[PDB]
Amino acid sequence: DDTPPPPPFLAGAPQDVVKAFFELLKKDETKTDPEIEKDLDAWVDTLGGDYKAKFETFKKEMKAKEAELAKAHEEAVAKMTPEAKKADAELSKIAEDDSLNGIQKAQKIQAIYKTLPQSVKDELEKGIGPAVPQ
Secondary structure, three states, X not given: OOOOOOOOOOOOOOHHHHXXXXXXXXXXXXXXXXXXXXXXXXXXXXXXOOHHHHHHHHHHHHHHHHHHHHHHHHHHHOOOOXXXXXXXXXXXXXXXXXXOOOHHHHHHHHHHHOOOOHHHHHHHHOOOOOOOOO
């Protein structure tokens, strides 16, 4: 089938660590490959061992899958709805550079702006829909 890795991301550690890995994994058993490996890597950054090579290769593989998906999805989205272009542009730039944060603000602004007509702006300009029907 198509499922994430069930083994330890940091394969090589003792039973004391294998319990922490499994107890963490049973909570994210229903997540994706990059979503599990992220959480595993976050605590692995405090271990310090050969698992560093698995991190370097993982970050590339994840960034590669995400960037390629985001490129294809963005290409098809360019002929679609305008809000979709904004979301997919954010997803495409972040999928090559996760260290570039703060764009989440402008992505939210655009996503709401495409669904902020003059009707809702005028009804909320006075407050919270002052005596307005369904």
